[PDB]
Amino acid sequence: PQITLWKRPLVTIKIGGQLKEALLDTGADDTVIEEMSLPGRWKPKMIGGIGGFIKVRQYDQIIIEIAGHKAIGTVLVGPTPANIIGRNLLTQIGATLNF
Amino acid sequence: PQITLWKRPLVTIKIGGQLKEALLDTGADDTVIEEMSLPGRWKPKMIGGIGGFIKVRQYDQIIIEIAGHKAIGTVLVGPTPANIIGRNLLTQIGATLNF
């Protein structure tokens, strides 16, 4: 779709077979999801945002459906204030900004 | 224009008589600009993201040009690691996310 921005661009995602709400976030390089049980191997990583750095579990090559569109890529799982879909997966679903 | 997400969606902005580069950020409710000496009154605010909260100064009715498009609204100034154009101004320039 075409999504205007008067409200937060929230969508439903499916990750690990579970439905979740997430924010489409063009200011995020990476996708960061709240703590959850997730099938796949992971490696310890750090990621930094506006307020500093947090520890995350990095899961590569994870199947994730975003508003009905398929992506397979890296998901960082950790104590984020919000589930955010970043450019690593927005590019997979063909998203662009337009004005 | 159409702004790709293969790279960070950076555009040139003009604020306080200065040109800066800033992210077009659908994940940001508010606009956050790196520390600069804007004139006039302001109100203290705290905003939160990955890593926690930062202290910012809230300035209202600030004139800001975004990739050639005029906007006017609230801008938060403080020790952000990125200049962030949030939805309060993205809506004013007619930006959408499309996929």
Ligand SMILES: CC(C)CN(C[C@@H](O)[C@H](Cc1ccccc1)NC(=O)O[C@H]1CO[C@H]2OCC[C@H]21)S(=O)(=O)c1ccc2c(c1)OCO2
């Ligand atoms: C986390 C989301 C819900 C909010 N953030 C906007 C993001 O787009 C942010 C914007 C951002 C960009 C760069 C540096 C810091 C923040 N990106 C970010 O944290 O991305 C992280 C994941 O991928 C990595 O790439 C960039 C940092 C990492 S934010 O910067 O914390 C923020 C912006 C304006 C706000 C706000 C919070 O509260 C109210 O108004």
